[PDB]
Amino acid sequence: SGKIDKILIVGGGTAGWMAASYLGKALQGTADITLLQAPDIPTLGVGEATIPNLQTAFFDFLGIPEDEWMRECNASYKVAIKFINWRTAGEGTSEARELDGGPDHFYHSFGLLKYHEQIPLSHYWFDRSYRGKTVEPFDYACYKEPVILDANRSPRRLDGSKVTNYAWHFDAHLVADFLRRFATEKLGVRHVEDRVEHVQRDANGNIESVRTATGRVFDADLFVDCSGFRGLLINKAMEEPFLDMSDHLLNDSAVATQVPHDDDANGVEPFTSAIAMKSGWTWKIPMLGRFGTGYVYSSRFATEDEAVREFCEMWHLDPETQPLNRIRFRVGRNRRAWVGNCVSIGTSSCFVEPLESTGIYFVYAALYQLVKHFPDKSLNPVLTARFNREIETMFDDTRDFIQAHFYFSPRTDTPFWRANKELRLADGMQEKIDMYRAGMAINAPASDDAQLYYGNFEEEFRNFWNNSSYYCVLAGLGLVPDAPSPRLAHMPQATESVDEVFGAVKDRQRNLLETLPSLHEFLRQQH
Amino acid sequence: SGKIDKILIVGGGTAGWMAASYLGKALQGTADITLLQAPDIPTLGVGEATIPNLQTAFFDFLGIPEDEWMRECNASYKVAIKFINWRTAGEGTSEARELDGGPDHFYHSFGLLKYHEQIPLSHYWFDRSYRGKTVEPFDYACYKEPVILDANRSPRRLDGSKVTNYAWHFDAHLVADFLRRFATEKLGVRHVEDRVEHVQRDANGNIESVRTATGRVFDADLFVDCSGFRGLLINKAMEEPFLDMSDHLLNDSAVATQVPHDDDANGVEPFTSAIAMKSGWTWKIPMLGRFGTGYVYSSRFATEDEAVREFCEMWHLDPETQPLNRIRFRVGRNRRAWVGNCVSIGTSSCFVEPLESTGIYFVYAALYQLVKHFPDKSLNPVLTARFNREIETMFDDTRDFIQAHFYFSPRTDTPFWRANKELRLADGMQEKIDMYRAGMAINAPASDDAQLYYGNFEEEFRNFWNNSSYYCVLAGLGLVPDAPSPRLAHMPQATESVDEVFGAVKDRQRNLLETLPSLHEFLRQQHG
Numbered sequence A: 001s002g003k004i005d006k007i008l009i010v011g012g013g014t015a016g017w018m019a020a021s022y023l024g025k026a027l028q029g030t031a032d033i034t035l036l037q038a039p040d041i042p043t044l045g046v047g048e049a050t051i052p053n054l055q056t057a058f059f060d061f062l063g064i065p066e067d068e069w070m071r072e073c074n075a076s077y078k079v080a081i082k083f084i085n086w087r088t089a090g091e092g093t094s095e096a097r098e099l100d101g102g103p104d105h106f107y108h109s110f111g112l113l114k115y116h117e118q119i120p121l122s123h124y125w126f127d128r129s130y131r132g133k134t135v136e137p138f139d140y141a142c143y144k145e146p147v148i149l150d151a152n153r154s155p156r157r158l159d160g161s162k163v164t165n166y167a168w169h170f171d172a173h174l175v176a177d178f179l180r181r182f183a184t185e186k187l188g189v190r191h192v193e194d195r196v197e198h199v200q201r202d203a204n205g206n207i208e209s210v211r212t213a214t215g216r217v218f219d220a221d222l223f224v225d226c227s228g229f230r231g232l233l234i235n236k237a238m239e240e241p242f243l244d245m246s247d248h249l250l251n252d253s254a255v256a257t258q259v260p261h262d263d264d265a266n267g268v269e270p271f272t273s274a275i276a277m278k279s280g281w282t283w284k285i286p287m288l289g290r291f292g293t294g295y296v297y298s299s300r301f302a303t304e305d306e307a308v309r310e311f312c313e314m315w316h317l318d319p320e321t322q323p324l325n326r327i328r329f330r331v332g333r334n335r336r337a338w339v340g341n342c343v344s345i346g347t348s349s350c351f352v353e354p355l356e357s358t359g360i361y362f363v364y365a366a367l368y369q370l371v372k373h374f375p376d377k378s379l380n381p382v383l384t385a386r387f388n389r390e391i392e393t394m395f396d397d398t399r400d401f402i403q404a405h406f407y408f409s410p411r412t413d414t415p416f417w418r419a420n421k422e423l424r425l426a427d428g429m430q431e432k433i434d435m436y437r438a439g440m441a442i443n444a445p446a447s448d449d450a451q452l453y454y455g456n457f458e459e460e461f462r463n464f465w466n467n468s469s470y471y472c473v474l475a476g477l478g479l480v481p482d483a484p485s486p487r488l489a490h491m492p493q494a495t496e497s498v499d500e501v502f503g504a505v506k507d508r509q510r511n512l513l514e515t516l517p518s519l520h521e522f523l524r525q526q527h
Numbered sequence B: 001s002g003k004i005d006k007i008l009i010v011g012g013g014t015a016g017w018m019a020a021s022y023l024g025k026a027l028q029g030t031a032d033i034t035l036l037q038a039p040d041i042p043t044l045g046v047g048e049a050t051i052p053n054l055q056t057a058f059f060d061f062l063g064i065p066e067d068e069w070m071r072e073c074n075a076s077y078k079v080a081i082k083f084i085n086w087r088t089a090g091e092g093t094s095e096a097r098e099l100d101g102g103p104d105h106f107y108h109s110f111g112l113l114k115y116h117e118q119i120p121l122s123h124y125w126f127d128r129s130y131r132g133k134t135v136e137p138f139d140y141a142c143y144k145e146p147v148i149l150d151a152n153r154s155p156r157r158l159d160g161s162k163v164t165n166y167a168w169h170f171d172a173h174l175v176a177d178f179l180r181r182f183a184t185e186k187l188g189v190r191h192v193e194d195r196v197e198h199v200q201r202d203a204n205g206n207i208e209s210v211r212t213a214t215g216r217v218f219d220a221d222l223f224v225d226c227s228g229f230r231g232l233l234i235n236k237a238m239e240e241p242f243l244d245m246s247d248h249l250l251n252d253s254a255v256a257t258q259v260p261h262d263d264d265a266n267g268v269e270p271f272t273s274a275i276a277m278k279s280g281w282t283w284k285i286p287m288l289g290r291f292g293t294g295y296v297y298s299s300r301f302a303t304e305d306e307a308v309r310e311f312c313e314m315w316h317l318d319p320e321t322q323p324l325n326r327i328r329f330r331v332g333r334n335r336r337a338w339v340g341n342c343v344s345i346g347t348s349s350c351f352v353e354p355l356e357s358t359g360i361y362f363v364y365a366a367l368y369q370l371v372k373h374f375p376d377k378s379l380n381p382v383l384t385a386r387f388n389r390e391i392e393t394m395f396d397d398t399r400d401f402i403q404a405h406f407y408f409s410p411r412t413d414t415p416f417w418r419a420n421k422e423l424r425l426a427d428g429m430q431e432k433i434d435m436y437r438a439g440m441a442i443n444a445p446a447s448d449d450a451q452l453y454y455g456n457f458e459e460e461f462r463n464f465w466n467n468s469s470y471y472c473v474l475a476g477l478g479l480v481p482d483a484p485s486p487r488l489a490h491m492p493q494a495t496e497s498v499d500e501v502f503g504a505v506k507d508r509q510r511n512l513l514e515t516l517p518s519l520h521e522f523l524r525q526q527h528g
Ligand SMILES: Cc1cc2nc3c(=O)[nH]c(=O)nc-3n(C[C@H](O)[C@H](O)[C@H](O)COP(=O)(O)OP(=O)(O)OC[C@H]3O[C@@H](n4cnc5c(N)ncnc54)[C@H](O)[C@@H]3O)c2cc1C
Pocket: A010, A011, A012, A013, A014, A015, A016, A036, A037, A038, A039, A040, A046, A047, A048, A049, A050, A172, A194, A195, A196, A197, A226, A227, A228, A229, A230, A232, A283, A327, A345, A346, A347, A348, A354, A357, A358, A359, A360, A363
């Protein structure tokens, strides 16, 4: 048994061609990579949102500069997720209700909270807010972004210079085809259109070959399952159980479409919107000339017909003739992502609703971990176990985080919102909440330098949902600590000199609002 | 209801005065601190090795620059620990035995392995070593330090500039009095010389007051137990069990002394030496004009005078007129470090043999965690439990790492060394060892910039035993992965451009050996 010579990727979606590119690049010249792709019924481009380390962990690894892949994938910019109507009762409407003398929205941005005297700014904010010396919401106090996104500002100046961390909106299909052109033309990855009919296992349970409907036989040392929800290798052949996590997350379906948009009349929003509905929530993902939107809902509280009506009524579309994608979801993960010589990547591995833009991240996180734990033909079980462990906490921490959005929403107005609250949080989530209520940071980053964070994948992986995110969502929803951090009573000079830090955020808010172009103005100049 | 107003620290050894300093500085003007310390028979200054974040996480916190406290405490410099005779049978001697045409030593330095193409240098070194492309030991292949340490070089040039990460050797008593001066004269900590006679608990089991032999009563909101191994508050007053962990560590005793040394004829060694013995190991901690040494041994494999003799023979000392400290200690940690309103700090909290220079680190790492989890008079149970969780991971991870020095030693030549190979590793440690054999890094540091690591306590705390330390020790002892990392066979260009990384080390280790003063020469420049 020596090094891995041949790899077969089954599936050609976004997960499949990311796997081909990432492995083709990481193993360039030392493995023969073949990807089998069957023709499928095409779907509408309903948009995908990403996170900053898509450029630094994935496209940079491939050697592809941001502007080369954005121009082909007709991409727009994402500075935040804006959460609309999660605290107020009513119908599913794109317009924000009023709450406390302002619109009912909050932002989850990408910046990291600045440390002041070893303590995150979130704790100083809560200190003032608790003692009644401020009523400003958490996000507006601590981040510059909310003010400039309220104004649809660009994250780059017209000279290109970057003023905030950002990620991307795009149609996943265009990226998949950009990558297929890249893997096949630049990395030697070989594309074969064919449909798997039968998987041959040996007496050790490993995959020996796949036989296509053509009668061609593909053998390989390592098999990457990118077949999506079907899991034609990890689940069908290897029989690995799927853990259903509907005791943590009730959402299991979506209806989505794509809406033309006049960017010169209305501008382009530099964020993804997550709009609370009666039985779930709706995404809006701006792109060029159009936006993708989808209603993620719980089949147990809304029939598909009601969801379609709620979804169409909200965008004033025809429930009968609007081209819709109707989807039923597998929510959860495999008991183990990698079994024998079969690695699952993408939705064949795990799926959670895209409330925090993790779909694509789960793909290239797993491949980074796959290469880090790359085997040889002896398939040392410790590599397989280590990988599985990383994939397991990556998903479960996200499941936990996403659940908190529903658990801590104060809404009680529909059976869906009342039911979410009846679920139990996972033990590791409950323990984080206890910490948060006691005034401590949750997974505070070691440094507050965002380049170190978003530029170093292991630093960000080891601390993916950090204190800034927890505050954004938890404080946003209105769950706040029972009392300030007790150290702050012993730090009379820190709590006074901290005002100059909040005032710095305000100076940035005011100055960036006056000098930045709108996102649309910036997009036009690019092209 | 309300903030902590009054703290009482019981114990004024090294742990107490750091606790006074650190807490006195972190709560300045917002809490009254009293330290209560009894007249005890003092010990010989047997010396203490430290680690670089002593400056960045403790003295820098106090605002005390490195030059001020070094000159006052007669401190010398530590670049590494040198492990001697861990791989060869024989008696306890200070001279390295011979092994594969070289001396039987290896070093554990403070650097971090450079990354090359996201993979640590250790993986490329083992690649070559396993394919026969090299026979050079890991520590000499990957670190500049070993060559310059072999020549007792200084980590600083005579103009001051720092060419290596380093820490300190000093006599703990001197650092304690320096901190007692600092806390009492500049932080307002009130020092009371008296003996604890009675601890008064309230109905919920918390501590209400301690009464002294002179009849004085001191009350407080928070009690910090620095009474050493006695544990007068945490163990005796609060009844918190001590968890003995000699099923992982056999060493429970020591015999230690201070030996005078001719620095003008032999220079000053810039490293702690850990010298393997028949029934344990011996530290040597060089200072100015002298060095601390101590034989750490297992009372179940050597009687107390078997040890005194082995130890006096190796240093050519007279067993009958040499002043000797003899201690039997408890090994392990409290079930909970903090209970009620009582926080243990120092050996009242936990203890492991000083094979890796952790004892003082445990004091200020815990003080750091204490301030970060600082309570108010309602003593939120979540603050206590997170604190206790951080303390026990700190300790258990060190307990494991230390056990591995004895477990993977190849020696089989005394009951002691053969007895180490029949203990179990803790499952977590066993798991890291499996990863190591599989070619993987172990707790690889997020970055390879050592400033970001030794300068950011949170960074180092979350990653305290990083992959560099595991390779220094396991590869040093001769435990090496079953095969090279499977990724290296897929990275033709990486394994060829790595030759320039090993060459950069070879150049830097050749160039410093010619340009660096001896440590001695540097030491004389600072003191007058
Ligand atoms: C409806 C939907 C909406 C989503 N929306 C978002 C979003 O808004 N934001 C976000 O971040 N993420 C979103 N995601 C997650 C998204 O799918 C990620 O892009 C994910 O990484 C894609 O993984 P995948 O390609 O495995 O999924 P799939 O698209 O399910 O992969 C299916 C592929 O499997 C291949 N295949 C299957 N069977 C065979 C066979 N027998 N032979 C050969 N080939 C076969 C086909 O080629 C097909 O292209 C969404 C996912 C879905 C399904």
